[PDB]
Amino acid sequence: IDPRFPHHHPRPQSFWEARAKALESLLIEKGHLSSDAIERVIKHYEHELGPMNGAKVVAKAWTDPAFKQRLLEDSETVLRELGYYGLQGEHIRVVENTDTVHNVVVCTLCSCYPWPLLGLPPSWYKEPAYRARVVKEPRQVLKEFGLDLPDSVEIRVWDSSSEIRFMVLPQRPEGTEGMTEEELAKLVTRDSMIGVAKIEPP
Amino acid sequence: IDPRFPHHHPRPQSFWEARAKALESLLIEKGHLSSDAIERVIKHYEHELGPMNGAKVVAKAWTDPAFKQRLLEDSETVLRELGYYGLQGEHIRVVENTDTVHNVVVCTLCSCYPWPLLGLPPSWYKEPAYRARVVKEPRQVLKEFGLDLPDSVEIRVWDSSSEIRFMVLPQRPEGTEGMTEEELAKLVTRDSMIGVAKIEPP
Amino acid sequence: MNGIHDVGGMDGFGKVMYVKEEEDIYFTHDWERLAFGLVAGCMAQGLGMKAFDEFRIGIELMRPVDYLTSSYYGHWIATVAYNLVDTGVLDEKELDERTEVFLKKPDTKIPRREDPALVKLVEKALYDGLSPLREISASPRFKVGERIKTKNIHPTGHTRFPRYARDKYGVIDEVYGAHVFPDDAAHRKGENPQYLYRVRFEAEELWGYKQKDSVYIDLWESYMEPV
Amino acid sequence: MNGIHDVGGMDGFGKVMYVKEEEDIYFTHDWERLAFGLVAGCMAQGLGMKAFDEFRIGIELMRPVDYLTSSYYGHWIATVAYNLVDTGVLDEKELDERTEVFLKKPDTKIPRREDPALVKLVEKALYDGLSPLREISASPRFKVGERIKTKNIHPTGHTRFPRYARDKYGVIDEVYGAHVFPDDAAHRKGENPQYLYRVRFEAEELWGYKQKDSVYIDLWESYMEPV
Ligand SMILES: [Cl-]
Ligand SMILES: [Cl-]
Ligand SMILES: [Cl-]
Ligand SMILES: [Cl-]
Ligand SMILES: [Cl-]
Ligand SMILES: [Cl-]
Ligand SMILES: [Co+3]
Ligand SMILES: [Co+3]
């Protein structure tokens, strides 16, 4: 490495792996962490949480008009009542898609996403392309997801710049007559709760 | 490479080397370039041009008041008369350092620099740190070159956003009494003609 | 800080890599899982970070070349290392030496320790969270429907005021209440809560563009002024 | 285009790597010398580029990760390849195949050809240059000393209007004359010259900062409006 240009040379991902193990080792040796504390976190975020929680909320809103009304008027109270609350989900707001208003959520500055309700964010949600572009050319971004909105539909992009979090409530599609709440929940995609997709008829 | 992340993987510099040879080979085979055309360019920019041309202009300005006056009133005419003219030096302006005005030149958008007068730009001039920072915190940048200007000295940064080019005329230092024009030219540093250094007493 | 992380409105990052959600794998290396464990495990005990403000500035301070190449959980490893050294929990020399050990010998064994009490403590963080909502004696400077102008300020430390939203007219959409102020809290200078607002910005104002697009952004009171 | 190349006002790129000028080597690899030969050799004959406008946009279009890692003359190779393929001088498939040949066999011999007439032609470019000064029938919209406001425009093609200078008040310092207009010429859409001005901007206006600093920038007439 030419010392004029150290900034041209990224750390290899092997460095980050080694650094992670070094942090783990030192913190356990010094009594700050334990094997089971680390594993508890991994179990929670990889397996216990997920978008099925949001899907249940969406299906309940579609099937219970009183619940939907309550959810939209005070989502924080309602979501906490259901138990969808915790770290990075202390203050969750629900934004309703309508025929002429489409909502899309982003964290331009990093990756903020309501883990207790939706689980972990999509790969692309955390990366620069989506984050940079969705606030300026949301129609172009949505087209890359296969969502081509008419010029007459208004788009509202919600940038998660505080600890307030946002979930999109997508509209119930056609062809769902006679479906149960359970069956409807199965139709609710992760992507529809971020705003990058509508829900297809079954 | 994960096709979600091709943008994480830079071309190695071996690619650019191979690409250069491929361009050379194809262009020569197709009769667009010749060995001697390529070599002529290299000779010109590596050896024929250089900051000694600017140094001669500075030393002449210091020793000939009439010339300095002419140079500052119409540098393009004067520099062309001297033969310091050519590609990327068609329109060169000279900006005078004074006791309370310090000039610094940059190309924030790339690397523009008056080759016919100064030769090739410094390594750092073409790189992001200087380019990004000098327009916003020139005092901090100049301090990294060892130039710590008083708050009372005004700094003018010249961003080379068109084909107009700028050369800084630094002030003659103390301790140069009795020196010839030739000897004075030897004191004029490349860096002083960009504005990142004053000239030290001999 | 006007860093590489503040990408809103940038061009050149290319197409979004679409992937069916069912195929959108969470973790492809165990160190990525470990990164999650380190972040939450430390934060739950206030080690290096009490909440996410301290966490975010450690990522923002990454060398730009590392920020773009480390992969996501590399950011998390970077900020854990930064904050633990910054607060004196770990020594930088010791951390570097141990990193070198695992570089050269990746199969080096990790010490094992069961601590059920720490597990319960970590669970508390996971389920109780870390709400930044506070109360202050002052009243809000701004009201719903008010047209404000965001400031042209350039904090060199942490901020949640994205560059694309600076020096822009917007309309107050909601007054949330007072929230812990990131620009101070990230640097351990106190919670110093201020009123937090949601503010709507029109595409024409942000970009000079012509579509029916808007952006809603949450902004602290000190990021804005009346008109 | 609001690209990685437009770095004015960015933070995080770090310290400037100072080097004594006598030690500041021009070229450390022969392909870097070759890059210079390719650029000037092609431009002298109008191959892929007639002047520097076409040259610059090819660099600006680089993948950001390549722009930051290629090294300087890598930019030059990128834009020569881009422009020669874009104008139909070279075929992309043929160029890729030949690149692969030199990747796998770097010592592959380069064809030799002497062309003294082409040498003289290249010399003409080097010494005569490519002045972009033109004349137009219109008069300048702005005058020396006039306070202008630069536009908030976001060209997706080439421009010489740096983002840090957009939507800013400045004072006309000089009217240079009409110059070939980069935003059109880079895309081969005609010289379409416009009046070029030098404009002074104060630090307080650009950044909200408090020192005795200013920036002089050259701006085409269409980048600005009267106040
Ligand atoms: Cl570095
Ligand atoms: Cl929908
Ligand atoms: Cl790519
Ligand atoms: Cl000087
Ligand atoms: Cl970097
Ligand atoms: Cl890239
Ligand atoms: Co985030
Ligand atoms: Co340049």
CATH number of B194's domain = 3.90.330.10
Contact in structure between A87 and C126 (CB atoms under 8 Å): yes
CA torsion through residues C165, C169, C173, C174, sign = positive
The span from the first CA to the last CA of chain A, in angstroms, equals 57
What is the spatial distance between Cα D174 and Cα D16, in angstroms, rounded to a whole number? 31
Amino acid residing at B131: R
Please count the other Cβ atoms lying within 10 Å of the Cβ belonging to residue C155.
13
Whole-Å CA distances, A111 to A48, B65, C174, D208: 20, 63, 23, 29
Report the number of secondary-structure helices (H) and strands (E) in chain A. Answer: 9, 4
Contact in structure between D183 and D155 (CB atoms under 8 Å): yes
Amino acid residing at C87: T
CA torsion through residues B197, C1, C3, C8, sign = negative
What is the spatial distance between Cα D172 and Cα D184, in angstroms, rounded to a whole number? 23
Contact in structure between D200 and D170 (CB atoms under 8 Å): yes
Ramachandran category for residue B176: left, alpha or beta (phi over 0 → left; psi -120 to 50 → alpha): alpha
Tokens representing residue D11 in the block = 């933070």
Whole-Å CA distances, D67 to A201, C163, D36, D95, D166: 45, 23, 17, 20, 23
Tokens representing residue B92 in the block = 């060169």
Which residue is listed with tokens 């750092």?
B124
- Residue C62 in contact with partner chain A when CB distance is under 8 A: no
Contact in structure between D74 and D66 (CB atoms under 8 Å): yes
CB contact under 8 A, D10 and C2: yes
Residue B92, SS3 per DSSP: strand
Nearest residue on chain A to C110, alpha-carbon basis? A25
Tokens representing residue D174 in the block = 């000089």
Report the Cα D14 to chain-centroid distance in Å.
23
Contact in structure between D43 and D87 (CB atoms under 8 Å): no
Cα diameter, chain A: 69
Residue B105, SS3 per DSSP: strand
C185-203 burial, b for 16+ CB within 10 Å, e for fewer?
bbeeeebebbbbbbbebbb
**CATH 2.30.30.50 occupies which residues in chain C?**
133-226
CATH of D21-128, one of 3.40.50.20, 1.20.1440.230, 1.10.472.20, 1.20.1090.10: 1.10.472.20
Report the Cα A18 to chain-centroid distance in Å.
29
Tokens representing residue C147 in the block = 């047209």
D71 vs A contacts (CB less than 8 Å): 8
Tokens representing residue C27 in the block = 């973790």
Neighbours of chain C (3+ CB pairs under 8 A): A, B, D
What is the spatial distance between Cα A20 and Cα C39, in angstroms, rounded to a whole number? 11
Q: Which one of D21, D98, D162 has the shortest CB-CB distance to B161?
A: D162
Is D218 one of the annotated binding-site residues?
Answer: yes
B5 vs C contacts (CB less than 8 Å): 17
The span from the first CA to the last CA of chain D, in angstroms, equals 26
Strand partners, A189: none
Tokens representing residue D85 in the block = 């393929």
DSSP per residue, B56-70:
HHHHHHHH-HHHHHH
Q: Which one of C9, C70, C89 has the shortest CB-CB distance to A11?
A: C70
Contact in structure between C197 and C146 (CB atoms under 8 Å): no
What is the spatial distance between Cα C115 and Cα B94, in angstroms, rounded to a whole number? 72
User: Annotated catalytic, B152?
Assistant: no
Which residue is listed with tokens 């327009």?
B135
Please choose, from the candidates A43, B13, C20, C226, the residue with its C-alpha nearest in 3D space to the C-alpha of residue D75.
Answer: B13
Please choose, from the candidates C223, C204, C227, C226, the residue with its C-alpha nearest in 3D space to the C-alpha of residue C215.
Answer: C204
Which residue is listed with tokens 């898609």?
A97
What is the spatial distance between Cα C135 and Cα C220, in angstroms, rounded to a whole number? 14
Please choose, from the candidates B190, C124, C115, D168, the residue with its C-alpha nearest in 3D space to the C-alpha of residue A33.
Answer: C115
Which residue among the candidates A34, A35, A75, A111 is catalytic per the annotation?
A: A111
What is the spatial distance between Cα D16 and Cα B134, in angstroms, rounded to a whole number? 10
User: Annotated catalytic, B107?
Assistant: yes
Question: Which residues place a Cβ less than 5 A from the ion ligand 5?
Answer: A 7; C 63-65
Residue A106, SS3 per DSSP: strand
Chain B residues whose C-beta sits inside 8 Å of any chain A C-beta = 4-5, 7, 123-124, 127, 129
Distance to chain C for D74, nearest Cα, Å: 17
Smallest-distance ligand from the CA of D66: 6
Chain A interface disruption, residue of D2, D13, D17, D19, most A CBs within 10 A: D17
Please choose, from the candidates A29, A91, A115, the residue with its C-alpha nearest in 3D space to the C-alpha of residue C40.
Answer: A115
Whole-Å CA distances, B27 to A189, B19, D14, D83: 53, 12, 39, 13
Which resolution, in Å, applies to this structure?
Answer: 1.4
What is the spatial distance between Cα C175 and Cα A164, in angstroms, rounded to a whole number? 12
Instruction: Write the DSSP symbol of residue B174.
Output: S
Chain A interface disruption, residue of B11, B127, B130, B144, most A CBs within 10 A: B127
Please choose, from the candidates C77, C103, C72, C102, the residue with its C-alpha nearest in 3D space to the C-alpha of residue C90.
Answer: C77
What is the spatial distance between Cα B75 and Cα A15, in angstroms, rounded to a whole number? 54
What is the spatial distance between Cα B105 and Cα B108, in angstroms, rounded to a whole number? 9
Q: How far is the CA of C86 from the centre of ligand 6 (A)?
A: 31
Tokens representing residue C104 in the block = 């050269």
Cα diameter, chain C: 62
**CATH 1.10.472.20 occupies which residues in chain D?**
21-128
A8 vs D contacts (CB less than 8 Å): 68-69, 71
Strands A92-96 and A165-169: parallel
With vertex at residue A111, the alpha carbon angle to CA A107 and CA A115, rounded to the nearest 5 degrees, is 110
Dihedral, CA of residue C162, residue C167, residue C173 and residue C178, to nearest 10: 60
Distance to chain D for A145, nearest Cα, Å: 22
What is the spatial distance between Cα D189 and Cα D181, in angstroms, rounded to a whole number? 10
What is the spatial distance between Cα A25 and Cα A22, in angstroms, rounded to a whole number? 5
Which residue is listed with tokens 């979930």?
A167
Element at A55 (helix H, strand E): helix A52-63
Contact in structure between A129 and C15 (CB atoms under 8 Å): yes
CA torsion through residues D193, D198, D199, D201, sign = positive
Q: How far is the CA of D98 from the centre of ligand 3 (A)?
A: 21
User: Annotated catalytic, A112?
Assistant: yes
| A129: containing domain | 1-202
Distance to chain C for B15, nearest Cα, Å: 19
Whole-Å CA distances, B42 to A117, B38, B47, D35, D160: 63, 7, 8, 9, 28
What is the spatial distance between Cα A7 and Cα D16, in angstroms, rounded to a whole number? 11
Distance to chain C for D84, nearest Cα, Å: 22
Contact in structure between A58 and A188 (CB atoms under 8 Å): yes
Tokens representing residue D131 in the block = 């002045």
Return the axis-axis angle of helices B65-73 and B52-63, rounded to nearest 10°: 120
Please choose, from the candidates B122, B77, B69, the residue with its C-alpha nearest in 3D space to the C-alpha of residue B96.
Answer: B69
Residue B159, SS3 per DSSP: strand
DSSP per residue, chain D:
---TT--TT---S-------GGG--S-SSHHHHHHHHHHHHHHHTTSS-SSHHHHHHHHHTS-HHHHHHS-HHHHHHHHHHHHHHHTTSS-HHHHHHHHHHHHH-TTPPPP----HHHHHHHHHHHHH----EE--SSPPS--TT-EEEE-----SS--S--GGGTT-EEEEEEEEEEE--HHHHTTTS----EEEEEEEEEHHHHHS--SSEEEEEEEEGGGEEE-
What is the spatial distance between Cα B171 and Cα B38, in angstroms, rounded to a whole number? 39
DSSP per residue, chain C:
---TT--TT---S-------GGG--S-SSHHHHHHHHHHHHHHHTTSS-SSHHHHHHHHHTS-HHHHHHS-HHHHHHHHHHHHHHHTTSS-HHHHHHHHHHHHH-TTPPPP----HHHHHHHHHHHHH----EE--SSPPS--TT-EEEE-----SS--S--GGGTT-EEEEEEEEEEE--HHHHTTTS----EEEEEEEEEHHHHHS--SSEEEEEEEEGGGEEE-
Cα diameter, chain B: 69
Number of domains in chain B: 1
Tokens representing residue A40 in the block = 């508890």
CB contact under 8 A, D69 and A5: no
Tokens representing residue C205 in the block = 């104002």
Phi, psi of B79 (to 5 degrees): -65, -40
Q: Which one of D13, D25, D102 has the shortest CB-CB distance to B21?
A: D102
What is the spatial distance between Cα C90 and Cα C98, in angstroms, rounded to a whole number? 11
Nearest residue on chain C to D63, alpha-carbon basis? C12
Tokens representing residue C151 in the block = 């400031």
What is the spatial distance between Cα A48 and Cα A37, in angstroms, rounded to a whole number? 15
Return the axis-axis angle of helices B35-43 and D116-128, rounded to nearest 10°: 30
Which residue among the candidates A110, A123, A162, A192 is catalytic per the annotation?
A: A110
Chain C residues whose C-beta sits inside 8 Å of any chain D C-beta = 1-4, 9-14, 63-65, 68-69, 152-154, 156, 167, 207-209
Contacts of D57 (CB under 8 A, 6+ apart): D1, D79, D157, D158, D186, D187
CB contact under 8 A, C65 and D68: yes
Expt. technique: X-ray
Strand partners, D201: D215
Which residue among the candidates A112, A123, A160, A161 is catalytic per the annotation?
A: A112
CATH of domain C133-226: 2.30.30.50
Instruction: Write the DSSP symbol of residue A162.
Output: S
Q: Which one of D56, D65, D215 has the shortest CB-CB distance to B157?
A: D215
Please choose, from the candidates B132, A158, A179, A129, the residue with its C-alpha nearest in 3D space to the C-alpha of residue D163.
Answer: B132
Dihedral, CA of residue A13, residue A15, residue A18 and residue A23, to nearest 10: -110
Distance to chain C for D65, nearest Cα, Å: 8
Contact in structure between B138 and D213 (CB atoms under 8 Å): yes
Is B38 one of the annotated binding-site residues?
Answer: no
What is the spatial distance between Cα B84 and Cα B87, in angstroms, rounded to a whole number? 10
